[PDB]
Amino acid sequence: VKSQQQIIDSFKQANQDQLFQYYDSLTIDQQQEFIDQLSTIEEPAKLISTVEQAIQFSQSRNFTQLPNEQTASTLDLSKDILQNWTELGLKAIGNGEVAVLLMAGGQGTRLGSSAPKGCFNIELPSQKSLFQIQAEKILKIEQLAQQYLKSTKKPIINWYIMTSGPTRNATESFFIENNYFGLNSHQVIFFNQGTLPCFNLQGNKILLELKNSICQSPDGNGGLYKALKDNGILDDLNSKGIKHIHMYCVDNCLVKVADPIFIGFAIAKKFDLATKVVRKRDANESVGLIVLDQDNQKPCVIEYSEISQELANKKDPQDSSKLFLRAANIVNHYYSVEFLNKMIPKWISSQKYLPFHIAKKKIPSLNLENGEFYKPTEPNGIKLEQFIFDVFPSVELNKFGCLEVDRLDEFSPLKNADGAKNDTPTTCRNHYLERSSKWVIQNGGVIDNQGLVEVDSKTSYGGEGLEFVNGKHFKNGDII
Ligand SMILES: [Mg+2]
Numbered sequence: 001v002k003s004q005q006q007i008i009d010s011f012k013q014a015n016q017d018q019l020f021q022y023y024d025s026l027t028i029d030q031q032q033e034f035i036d037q038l039s040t041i042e043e044p045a046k047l048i049s050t051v052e053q054a055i056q057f058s059q060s061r062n063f064t065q066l067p068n069e070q071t072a073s074t075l076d077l078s079k080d081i082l083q084n085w086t087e088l089g090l091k092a093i094g095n096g097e098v099a100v101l102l103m104a105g106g107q108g109t110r111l112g113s114s115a116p117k118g119c120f121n122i123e124l125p126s127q128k129s130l131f132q133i134q135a136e137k138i139l140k141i142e143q144l145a146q147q148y149l150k151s152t153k154k155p156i157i158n159w160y161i162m163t164s165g166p167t168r169n170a171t172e173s174f175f176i177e178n179n180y181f182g183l184n185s186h187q188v189i190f191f192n193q194g195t196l197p198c199f200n201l202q203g204n205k206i207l208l209e210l211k212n213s214i215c216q217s218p219d220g221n222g223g224l225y226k227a228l229k230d231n232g233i234l235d236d237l238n239s240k241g242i243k244h245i246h247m248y249c250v251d252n253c254l255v256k257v258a259d260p261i262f263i264g265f266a267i268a269k270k271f272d273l274a275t276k277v278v279r280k281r282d283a284n285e286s287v288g289l290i291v292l293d294q295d296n297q298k299p300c301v302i303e304y305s306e307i308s309q310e311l312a313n314k315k316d317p318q319d320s321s322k323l324f325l326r327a328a329n330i331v332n333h334y335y336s337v338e339f340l341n342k343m344i345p346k347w348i349s350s351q352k353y354l355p356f357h358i359a360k361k362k363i364p365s366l367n368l369e370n371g372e373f374y375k376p377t378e379p380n381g382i383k384l385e386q387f388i389f390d391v392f393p394s395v396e397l398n399k400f401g402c403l404e405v406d407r408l409d410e411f412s413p414l415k416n417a418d419g420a421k422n423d424t425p426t427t428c429r430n431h432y433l434e435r436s437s438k439w440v441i442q443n444g445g446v447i448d449n450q451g452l453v454e455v456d457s458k459t460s461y462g463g464e465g466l467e468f469v470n471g472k473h474f475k476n477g478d479i480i
Contacts, residue, residue, distance in 0.1 A: 004035050011038060014045040015204070022371060034212040041197060048204065051384065054356045062294035063302060063311070064403050065324060070299070072265060073404035079437065088267045089260025092244055093145040099158040099237060100138070100258050101228075101247040103173065103221050103331075103388075106164035111425070112417045116167040118250045119174055120414060122401045122425040124432060125454045125477045130250055130414070131174065131218040135159075135181035135188075136457035137257040144461060145212055145260075157258050158187045164218050165192045183459055191231035193223050198363055207381050208366045210373065215365050215381070220357065221249070221331075222386025226348045236338050245335045247388075251414045252330065253428040254435060256462055262334055265403050272339040273392070274401030276332035278411050283313040288329040288389070290402050298393040299400045301329055327391070327402060330411045334401070347391050354386040402418060409435055409464035411461070439463040440480065444470035451476025 002010070011019055019038070023031060075084065076145050094097050108117040118131040128136075138157050141303065146154040153255045163171045174191050175181070180188055197206040198215035209215040217227075224247075227236045237245070243264065256262070266274045277290050286304050293300045304312070307325065314324040347353040360379040367374045392400070405411070412431035415423035433452035440453055443466040447453055460466050460480075469480065 002039060004031070007035050007038050009244065014048055016044070016206055018205060019208060019214065021208075026212050030212040036457060037213060047197070048206070050351060050358060051199055051382075052203040054351075055201075055358055055382065058358050061302075061306065063291040063294045063307070063325065064294050065070055065316075066290065066292045066299060066327070066400075067397070070397070070400055071327075071404065073260065075404065075406055085264030085268055086260045087148065088264035089258075089262070090141075090145040090261055093141065093157060093258060093260065093266060094149040094151060094155045096155055096241065097243040098258055099160060099240070099242045099245055101224065101233075101245055102134070102159060102161045103247070104161050104163050104167070104250045106167050106218060110417060111414065114287070116171045116174070117414070118161075118171065120425070122414065122429045122432070124429055125455070125479050129174075130253060132178070132181045133253065133256065133457070135183055137255070137461065139182055140457045140461045141258050141260065141391060142293060143430050145462075146229060156184065156187050158189060158236075158242070159183070160189045160191065160236075162191055162193050162224060162227055165195065168192050178380040189233070189236070191227060191233055193227050194219050198361075198365070199382050199384075200368075201360070201379070201381060202335055203358075203382060207363065209364070210366065211330055211371065215363055217383045220356050220385030221388040222390060224388060225344050225354070225391070228340070228384060229344055229348060233255070234340060237478070238341070245333075245337060245338050245340065247333045247335065249331045249413075252332070252411055253414055253432055254410055254412045255332070256410055259462075262332075262403060266334045266336070266401060266414060269335065269401055270399075271401040272336050272399040273395045274334040274403060275389075275392075276330055276403050276405050276410070277327040278330055278407040280326040280328040283323055285308075285328065289325050290327040290329055292397075293393065296393065298397060299395065299402070300392050301387075301389040327404065330405075331388070332411075333388070339395075339399075343391070343394060346393070353391050353394055355390060356384045359383045359385060408438070436480070439466055440469050440474065443467055444472075445477075446471075446473045447476070448473055448474055453478045453480055455480050 008020065104116060104118050111120060113120055116279045119129050121127055121129050138159060140156055142154045149223050168190060175188055195216040196219045198217050199206055207215040244263050246263060248255050260392055262276060275290060280287060288301045288303050290301055311325065316322045316324045359382060361381060361383050362379055363381040364375045412428050413423050414425065414428045418424050418426055433454055436455040437447055437452045439455055456479055
């Protein structure tokens with residue numbers, strides 16, 4: 001711990017004299033709170049140099065399809081192979097070797113909600129929040145594993161939920177008020193994501209939010225790795241004997257939590273890291289793509305921008321009807337705990353694996369002239385973010401896997417408030433109900449009046465066990 005003077009001197013030496021412009025006019029308590037905040041910034045001099053340089057760089061690659069040996073598709077695999085992977089996955093779950101890391105983010109502000117995003121109700125007939133839907137998915141897969149192994153008690157899948165600092169209390173309160181949706185209170189473990197200072201447009205100065213406080217912001221989903229180390233989560237995976245991790249984002253209302261087929265794929269192929277993708281059908285779709293970087297022969301994720309319209313439109317040589325680069329990233333990963341133990345210390349210590357991504361933003365803060373707070377109408381600074389997928393190139397190519405899945409069954413994200421064309425509570429609700437209805441019709445059920453039904457996870461995790469609906473008629477809104 002450093003004293004008031006040592007803290008002040010370290011920021012002044014790092015050319016941040018503007019942070020103390022009003023320091024002497026503050027009360028002693030205001031000063032002490034400010035020093036405490038500044039003390040939380042790890043190696044500030046190093047941070048500032050990295051940012052300014054990163055901003056300069058932000059103002060000719062060779063990409064191709066991943067090698068066939070590293071890919072697979074649930075749309076192509078035989079039912080027997082899918083069942084074998086499911087069994088490998090249920091076996092791991094049944095032996096307590098599987099845990100889930102959830103990136104829950106912050107408030108559902110963009111959706112028009114002040115509550116944590118996981119609390120959002122897309123208005124299914126059941127009115128269940130995203131958190132409850134995912135909690136029931138976990139309970140059901142624990143049940144399917146128990147049945148497969150014929151165990152006396154159901155196995156436990158620990159669910160580690162990373163919240164932003166501001167939503168930690170409301171998130172934990174929501175779970176407690178609902179008695180953990182039926183899960184054991186000990187298997188839901190909360191931990192907060194870290195933050196980084198916000199900077200001016202050039203990236204050479206940290207911004208003051210108030211006369212005695214700097215602007216800070218969540219450090220991107222790539223901040224997960226450092227949060228796992230610092231909050232003792234990696235320690236806990238080891239103490240609990242966990243071997244396999246399924247990681248995803250709370251906003252996917254269709255997510256197959258702890259999917260045994262995905263875990264089994266990784267076990268069968270002995271992968272250190274794997275990812276799920278869905279087919280990109282329109283060369284115009286705005287989504288990240290998983291590709292092979294031919295220059296370093298490593299797997300990686302590229303944004304729509306980094307590809308030429310030509311390559312984006314290029315068709316596959318072995319099937320002109322499909323796009324050449326069609327592996328759309330749905331932020332759904334597998335990691336082996338052995339790989340995490342080995343790589344986390346490396347990843348969090350260098351820009352090589354987790355480079356800062358820069359975002360120009362309108363940041364409410366002190367006006368650089370008068371020193372009074374204000375809400376800008378044009379970008380006046382930048383926010384930093386690390387991306388979860390930037391660690392992909394560090395994996396050995398033959399230890400990386402990419403599983404293509406069916407979008408209609410596995411991915412429908414909640415991103416925009418109702419009114420937009422895509423990714424709204426309405427599209428999520430309709431995709432969820434259409435998936436449920438499809439499952440029912442596939443099993444011989446019939447839905448009257450052009451309606452839709454909802455399938456409860458306690459009845460079916462992903463379409464199995466619905467043989468009993470054969471010949472039965474359902475009404476719009478029925479829950480099965
Ligand atoms: Mg393949």
